[PDB]
Design an enzyme around this catalytic site. Sequence first.
Site, short mmCIF file in Angstrom:
data_model
loop_
_atom_site.label_atom_id
_atom_site.label_comp_id
_atom_site.label_asym_id
_atom_site.label_seq_id
_atom_site.Cartn_x
_atom_site.Cartn_y
_atom_site.Cartn_z
N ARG A 64 -10.36 -11.88 0.69
CA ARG A 64 -11.21 -12.88 0.07
C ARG A 64 -10.54 -14.26 0.09
O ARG A 64 -11.22 -15.28 0.06
CB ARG A 64 -11.56 -12.47 -1.36
CG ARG A 64 -10.39 -12.55 -2.33
CD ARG A 64 -10.67 -11.83 -3.63
NE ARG A 64 -10.81 -10.39 -3.44
CZ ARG A 64 -11.05 -9.53 -4.42
NH1 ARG A 64 -11.17 -9.96 -5.67
NH2 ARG A 64 -11.16 -8.23 -4.15
N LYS B 88 0.83 -1.20 0.00
CA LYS B 88 0.00 0.00 0.00
C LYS B 88 0.87 1.25 0.00
O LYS B 88 1.06 1.89 1.03
CB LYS B 88 -0.94 0.00 1.21
CG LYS B 88 -2.09 -0.99 1.10
CD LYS B 88 -2.86 -1.11 2.42
CE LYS B 88 -3.86 -2.25 2.36
NZ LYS B 88 -4.92 -2.02 1.34
C1 LIG Z 1 -8.62 -5.15 -5.65
C2 LIG Z 1 -7.69 -4.02 -5.26
C3 LIG Z 1 -6.40 -4.19 -6.03
C4 LIG Z 1 -8.31 -2.69 -5.66
O1 LIG Z 1 -7.39 -4.05 -3.88
C5 LIG Z 1 -8.34 -3.54 -2.96
O2 LIG Z 1 -9.53 -3.86 -3.05
N1 LIG Z 1 -7.91 -3.09 -1.77
C6 LIG Z 1 -8.66 -3.47 -0.62
C7 LIG Z 1 -7.83 -4.36 0.27
O3 LIG Z 1 -6.66 -4.08 0.50
N2 LIG Z 1 -8.40 -5.44 0.83
O4 LIG Z 1 -7.64 -6.31 1.70
C8 LIG Z 1 -9.08 -2.29 0.23
C9 LIG Z 1 -8.68 -0.99 -0.03
C10 LIG Z 1 -9.11 0.04 0.80
C11 LIG Z 1 -9.93 -0.24 1.90
BR1 LIG Z 1 -10.54 1.14 3.06
C12 LIG Z 1 -10.32 -1.55 2.16
C13 LIG Z 1 -9.89 -2.57 1.33
ZN LIG Z 2 -5.61 -5.95 1.36
#
Ligand SMILES: CC(C)(C)OC(=O)N[C@@H](C(=O)NO)c1ccc(Br)cc1
Ligand SMILES: [Zn+2]
Lengths: 516, 519, 513
Positions: free
Chosen positions: A377, A300
């Site tokens: 997921r 991130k």
């Molecule tokens: C599919 C993609 C590449 C776009 O990745 C995300 O969907 N990231 C989510 C995540 O990291 N889940 O674990 C997320 C981002 C921000 C927030 Br607030 C919650 C969840």
């Molecule tokens: Zn994540």
Amino acid sequence: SEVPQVVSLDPTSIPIEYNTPIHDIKVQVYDIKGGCNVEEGLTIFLVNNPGKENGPVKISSKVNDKQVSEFLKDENMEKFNVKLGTSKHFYMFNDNKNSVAVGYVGCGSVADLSEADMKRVVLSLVTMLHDNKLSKLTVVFEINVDKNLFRFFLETLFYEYMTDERFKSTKNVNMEYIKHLGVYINNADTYKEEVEKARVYYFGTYYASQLIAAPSNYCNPVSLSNAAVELAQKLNLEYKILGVKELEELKMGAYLSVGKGSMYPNKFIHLTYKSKGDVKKKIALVGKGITFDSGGYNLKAAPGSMIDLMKFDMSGCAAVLGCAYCVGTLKPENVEIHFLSAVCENMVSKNSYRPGDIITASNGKTIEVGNTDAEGRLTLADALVYAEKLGVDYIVDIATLTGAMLYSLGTSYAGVFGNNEELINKILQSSKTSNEPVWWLPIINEYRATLNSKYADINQISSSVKASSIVASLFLKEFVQNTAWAHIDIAGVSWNFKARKPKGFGVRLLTEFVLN
Amino acid sequence: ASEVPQVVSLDPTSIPIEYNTPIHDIKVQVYDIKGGCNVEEGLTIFLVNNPGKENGPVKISSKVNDKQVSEFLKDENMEKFNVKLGTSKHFYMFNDNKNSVAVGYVGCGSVADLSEADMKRVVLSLVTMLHDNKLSKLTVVFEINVDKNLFRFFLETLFYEYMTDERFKSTDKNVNMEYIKHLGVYINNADTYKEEVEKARVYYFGTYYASQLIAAPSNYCNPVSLSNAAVELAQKLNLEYKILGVKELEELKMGAYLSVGKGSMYPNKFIHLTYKSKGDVKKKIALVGKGITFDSGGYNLKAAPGSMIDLMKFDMSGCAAVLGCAYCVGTLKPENVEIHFLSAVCENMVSKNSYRPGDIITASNGKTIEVGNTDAEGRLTLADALVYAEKLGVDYIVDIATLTGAMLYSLGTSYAGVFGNNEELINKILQSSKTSNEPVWWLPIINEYRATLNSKYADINQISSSVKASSIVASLFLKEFVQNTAWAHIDIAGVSWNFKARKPKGFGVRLLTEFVLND
Amino acid sequence: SEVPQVVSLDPTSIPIEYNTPIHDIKVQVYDIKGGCNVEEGLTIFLVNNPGKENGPVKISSKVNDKQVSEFLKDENMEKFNVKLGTSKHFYMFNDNKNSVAVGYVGCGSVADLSEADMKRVVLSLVTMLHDNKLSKLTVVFEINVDKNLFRFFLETLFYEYMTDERFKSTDEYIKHLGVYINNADTYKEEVEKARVYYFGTYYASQLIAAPSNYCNPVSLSNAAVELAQKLNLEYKILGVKELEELKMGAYLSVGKGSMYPNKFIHLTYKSKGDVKKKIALVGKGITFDSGGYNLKAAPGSMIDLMKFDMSGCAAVLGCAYCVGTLKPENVEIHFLSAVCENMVSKNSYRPGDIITASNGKTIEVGNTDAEGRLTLADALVYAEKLGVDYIVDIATLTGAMLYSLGTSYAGVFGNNEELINKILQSSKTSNEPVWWLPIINEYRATLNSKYADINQISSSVKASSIVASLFLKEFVQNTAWAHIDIAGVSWNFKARKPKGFGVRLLTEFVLND
Ligand SMILES: CC(C)(C)OC(=O)N[C@@H](C(=O)NO)c1ccc(Br)cc1
Ligand SMILES: [Zn+2]
Ligand SMILES: CC(C)(C)OC(=O)N[C@@H](C(=O)NO)c1ccc(Br)cc1
Ligand SMILES: CC(C)(C)OC(=O)N[C@@H](C(=O)NO)c1ccc(Br)cc1
Ligand SMILES: [Zn+2]
Ligand SMILES: [Zn+2]
Ligand SMILES: [Zn+2]
Ligand SMILES: [Zn+2]
Ligand SMILES: [Zn+2]
């Protein structure tokens, strides 16, 4: 059970306050039809004026004091307004020539107050409670509320009043909670049963809040699973913590892969509540339990990724455990509930799983990892096959899965997805009575083709469809074969950015689902 | 001394340090210009200017004890050349003894009082004449006015720029390197300037020593090897030293400092050097240096454009400045003063063991801190170091650090910023800046921004989520860890590395030494 | 004079409120030793507590009312704390059975309140005024403040109390202010000065807050004229034809792409009698900064805020109000602003263009978003020809200021230390914080153009604020000059409104000289 440390100064458990100052508050409910006594502490009237925009304040209630009633006569009160959130304080002497404090909170001009409306009223009320050393607060309901809204008032009151000082060392010296709460309302007898229910719902929510707010060095897979055990022991839930050896035997390849790069071993939480009588419904509640989400090698690092907030990524687990408290306390009947959470940590390491890796879920499905930041997921996948193996009637998972929720429903409404319309309706019904707003979103099957992997059975993510929340739901749907299942995405609603604290969202929602 | 851990046997286990430099082998002679100049071997350079005559003609005022050379340098011959700053010329001729001699000049502009930057340009031009010419002796004739401090600055800068770091050269060593062995200086009232010579040589190496530490890559220069170098230095200078390992740091509950290093393969090492005067001690001073041997940024990885992750060996510059100061102090041996040289050395890396954004950690003074950004690790280590420093019961605490990149946007690459809680201490630093010719500017600690450090759960936030005035916010953070002692903080993040010349400056060594000496 | 329009619905002038409710407030100052009377309205005690936990509230002043005195007893007040910005107010009946409101505002534990602290006190006070239909406010000073801070209190009070509703279509204020303070006679002279300083600040605020479709070069210059006429100042507005003749190519280049013609504002104040000091005040007047072809498209460029980019001009005009009203002696002031608009068009000036300033220097444009210094260049050449003793320019020049001093302190640069010190002294007495930053000559070489006489911008040297100062310095040859960069302090991001920063600062500078 033993929390690993890098240095001896690293914490080995999550500090938890079970007995809160709220629990020491003696609550009395009186019928307004008998007059109000205005003696000690602060007395607040909740007043409105239906359809007068910003109308004059009028106190309808009988006050068993000539002096206070004289002060509160209409001629005196017309200079004040009923604007939503507005509050005022009054000083006077009563019949016994004692100094008393009286005031009011405006509840607007609409007869039926919404959750947001009620929240603003409470927040205004709490402002009066802060920075004033009061011993007793008296609230007089001169507005219309049903029992559900009344319970919501108390839950919100308790929750917002309560302050988390677990991580303060060098702390508000002047904190001093009230010891008594008086409530005047009509037909008090019907509302009395809601008082203790509110107190239980409060702590369930506040307990989840404590777990979420706890930083990742305090709250890790080991310490969180340890906390679950401690909670289960106090509440008589059967409990079972699955370690790596058990998880390997169960072949949870998707779940174990996420935790590979972490210094904390994976811990699978399984709590169970069983009613003593005939069981008519079996329900599995699944929570996403990522104690910290770095994103993995898909770090991130992009702007707006909010990496410093990612302790919140176990909110789903916290909600499930918070629900376990309420259920364990209220002790519903004719139902058996399994509280599940695949807890781990998503970190960057030489041992971490890589983008492009193909992993095998416990149902035999091979998964091509396209993004290590979509780890939720993956853990939920193995948790769901586990849930279905329990032979339940409903599977409800709750998770901070996708950031797209911030762009779809925002920070107030959670999204619910599912394969069963009646189950979804039950969740929607629970949302109304728990006053935790949820909106039904579709699982659009047309996007399924975007999960078609060239080498594995299925892709973890899509490289086309930008509707990630739907795509993720489509992924999870592949791991529930023949059971009614629903998925609540709370990524947008879990954290209160304005208040800089968790909401404990989902606790009251899941409990209402179980109880009703 | 501790053993440096290795991943492979080819990993270096020590920082190569050159103590005996060719500069130390140079014999320096100072003559009075009134006795006339002798022009014999090697290269003789006249430093000339022309007061308010925008590129004016060159005029040699000094008497030359040679009829042939004096005739060559007569005004009629020299008027074809000008005194533009940085301009240089070479002359070839025969002297009275029929020997071939080399003469030249360097233009010093039209301004009577040369600044540090101007003097630097003069020196740089001079060094070019030294480079690619196999000379045995350099003679410099001052036909310009410089005070003792500026005169010393000339020598220090000359020595520093002349010197070339070849520690990491193997197959590409310069075959043509051959330093001069003799340096002659002609100047007015020389007896007053003679004391500055050896002082300059001391100040030079302190700076060059710090430069060597900074330029050393992170695989060579790690917390263990750097602390080992500190020990080796202390032994040579007869200074008291103490290296604190993880176990001792845990006992002192230095949680903020320990959290940063958690993700590293190198154990944290806390450097404590001490110089004690033989006589009655009248002033006690603690010098604290930021010592991050490599700054990856942590989980807040330096992945954004302009983050300069390949430069992050520089992030221990403060520590290097402090250690370079220890050399100067230990060598010149000021008296009636007690100096503590401190540095909480560690490495900020990405790992399963790394500390996370959002973690709440406890400093050694009991304050709990919420981490909002792991790339702001400097202030975390400095926090525990300052608490340690104040426990020593000193009169002044001065920390120096490559703390914030915002310095590049505030003061740039030439002037360092100083913050503090005590105006007399700040003025002393400013006074030291003038005499050392290492530019420092006073910046404010704005108390209004303090509220943005109010954490919801911890005692204090590590960073702000609004202000963006990074340098000031960081100073506000550090201020919370100094309770009742005069304290100042020098942010050298912008001035430490010379981007044009691609090398460290060793900034801070001369500044800190001047501060201790003139106190 | 005539504002061009694209459609008939486009506004043709800036709406200005001259007579504000603040001007209708009668202010009385009483000595605290005589005791406080609680009759009408709201009474607020300003209290502190040295070494406060924060500690409990204690009211020391004597109140000539039994009902109120019972309320203000130590036992009742100990339930409240004195933490900065905390407030409580109650409604009750006094001895004469009249409805009264009594309360306090916490002033922390520090004896000497700072500029930032006092503002927090005022905002809490104003918060109660916006939610109480009061006729009279009475403030009791149980803290120590000098004459300057007392004036600052009133200015901030008036400014924050006032609400701009000019652009509210549709789809109250107190009339009396009472002040109880020790040595009252000393503070009385500060009252009307504060009222003047208030509107000067608020007038500047109105110009800044006014959107770019309302506030354009024509409408802004028209507003300046109207102001000059009300204050009986000599005025002169230079148009394109005059500017071309003066060969102000740098200034004219910036405005080329705009539909609004360039307008150079020149106001002058001369004191009655012998003139001892001549001063030119120059304000940056870009009514809207799109950035030009160097469009503000990058994240954090905050293009929606760029109406603020004429704050320097507004500050100068706000100063013109104060100077013209208070009428200082022995001084001659020139109020200058090269007003224009930086837009994207086929007529716009391009990155790479070489333009000639009115002093003959050729300038290579490296970034069209650095248009502020270009307009200031010609303005500075214009200013020095007026033959003044001091030149002070004020401008929202560089966003780098947000990284150096932030949003509270403005930066000042200059070529003369005496002028700089006077500005700093003015900063202290006006309580508009300014910090001295250096003009580092070593960076000058980065402005050396390959083809032109000088570069507009540097190609590296991230110290933008200093480099820009280095640029402007090239256009002042033999005059004491100072430059105040207010890009970070101009807009109050939390409150979503201008601060009117600089008005009081510039006036104190003129007054105390
Ligand atoms: C599919 C993609 C590449 C776009 O990745 C995300 O969907 N990231 C989510 C995540 O990291 N889940 O674990 C997320 C981002 C921000 C927030 Br607030 C919650 C969840
Ligand atoms: Zn994540
Ligand atoms: C607070 C913030 C998130 C902006 O982080 C920085 O302040 N970064 C500095 C740092 O990483 N300190 O450890 C830094 C960057 C570049 C240079 Br060059 C020097 C110092
Ligand atoms: C570095 C550069 C040369 C582009 O200068 C700017 O940073 N732009 C300033 C500007 O647009 N002047 O006209 C500016 C930007 C933001 C703020 Br807030 C103030 C001033
Ligand atoms: Zn996640
Ligand atoms: Zn860093
Ligand atoms: Zn660093
Ligand atoms: Zn611009
Ligand atoms: Zn601009």
